[PDB]
RNA sequence: UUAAGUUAGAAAGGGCGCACGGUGGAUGCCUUGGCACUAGGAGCCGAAGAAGGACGGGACUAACACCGAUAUGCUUUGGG
């Protein structure tokens, strides 16, 4: 959260844009029954949220 | 032995009493919920989109509760 802050906004646009990447990729996994840290989800889940929050606060 | 006479016992089933079960949910005990008030506060919400909903959100999710594509939560400030 406090490291997030630190980047720009265009570089925070960039990590979002991974971790959609990854929270696609990892429902992929899920359906095709490949995923075993299936908690890794919720966590990917919370940090796009977290992101969109603090670009949200930027303005 | 014949004759005459008298009386017993019997239960297919049934009755009464008793014993033991079943069914059923009365009664007692209990309380998560109600009822009536008192004192104090507050008496409004809505185009900045209401009341009330629908469909969604969990690793798996039928329902309830919570939440809204940032969805079983996000940030922050305090408590702990
Ligand atoms: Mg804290």
Same mark, same amino acid.
């Given at each position: 959260?406090?490291?997030? !802050?630190? =980047?720009? &906004? &265009? /570089? #925070? *646009?960039? *990590?979002?844009?991974? =971790?959609?990447?990854? =929270?696609?990729?990892? !429902?992929?996994? =899920?359906?095709?029954? *490949?995923?075993?840290? &299936?908690?890794? #989800? ?5 940090? #796009?949220? !977290?992101?969109? &929050? #603090?670009?949200?606060? !930027? /303005?």
């Amino acid at each position: 959260a406090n490291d997030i !802050r630190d =980047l720009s &906004t &265009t /570089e #925070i *646009q960039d *990590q979002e844009k991974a =971790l959609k990447e990854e =929270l696609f990729n990892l !429902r992929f996994q =899920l359906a095709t029954g *490949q995923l075993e840290n &299936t908690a890794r #989800i919720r966590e990917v889940r919370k940090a #796009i949220a !977290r992101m969109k &929050t #603090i670009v949200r606060e !930027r /303005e």
